[PDB]
Design a protein around this ligand. Structure first.
Ligand SMILES: [Mg+2]
Ligand SMILES: [Mg+2]
Length: 209
């Protein structure tokens, strides 16, 4: 398994330990490259049969003007540092982030590396399995995966590998603090785009050297 360079997978029941191993080796792929890597992979690959974790996050908080928003982050952030995964406060599984950090990510909102979307828009959307047909119009799909092209790309692969219904999952993380969760992409068992999973526990990263 090489992704142009040598690529090892990094599992642990302690997320911080897994990420730390991954970062000692090389660097962990964020969700866009994680997704692509799967698209490049052929039937039989552990990339297709194991669920996977990315240091990408889904964060919920307030803009300076105090509007609730959800942002999907595919760059280095507070929760892609293992020491923070260990030590930050957790509220229903989500890690607490500094207001400064959440606002720094808000300002990086292009629609390419960081996607900001409206809280009510996600909260009114489904959390669960839906036909691939309806996937792309779901508020999570495109920011989650990182681009409309890439998302339609993966949905293609998805129909071929996992089938005709996809899991798009999320929960309500609007609380008195900014809250982040690392993103998971499922397998045959755990199906789809998983953004309601708690931090600190099971994780499987992909590192490249
Ligand atoms: Mg632990
Ligand atoms: Mg805080």
């Amino acid at each position: 398994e090489i992704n142009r360079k040598q690529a090892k997978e990094f599992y642990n029941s302690d997320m911080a330990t897994a990420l730390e191993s991954c970062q000692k080796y090389g660097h962990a792929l964020f969700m866009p490259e994680l997704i692509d890597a799967k698209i490049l992979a052929t039937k039989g690959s552990s990339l297709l049969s194991n669920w996977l974790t990315a240091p990408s996050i889904r964060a919920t908080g307030r803009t300076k003007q105090g509007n609730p928003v959800v942002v999907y982050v595919h760059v280095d952030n507070y929760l892609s540092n293992p020491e923070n995964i260990r030590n930050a406060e957790r509220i229903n599984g989500a890690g607490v982030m500094p207001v400064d950090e959440f606002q720094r990510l808000l300002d990086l909102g292009d629609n390419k590396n960081v996607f900001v979307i409206d809280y009510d828009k996600l909260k009114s959307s489904s959390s669960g399995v839906i036909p691939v047909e309806r996937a792309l119009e779901h508020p999570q799909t495109i920011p989650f995966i990182g681009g409309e092209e890439r998302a339609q790309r993966y949905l293609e692969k998805f129909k071929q590998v996992y089938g005709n219904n996809i899991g798009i999952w999320h929960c309500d993380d609007l609380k008195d603090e900014p809250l982040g969760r690392l993103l998971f992409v499922g397998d045959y068992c755990n199906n789809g785009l998983i953004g309601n999973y708690g931090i600190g526990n099971y994780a499987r990263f992909v590192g490249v050297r």
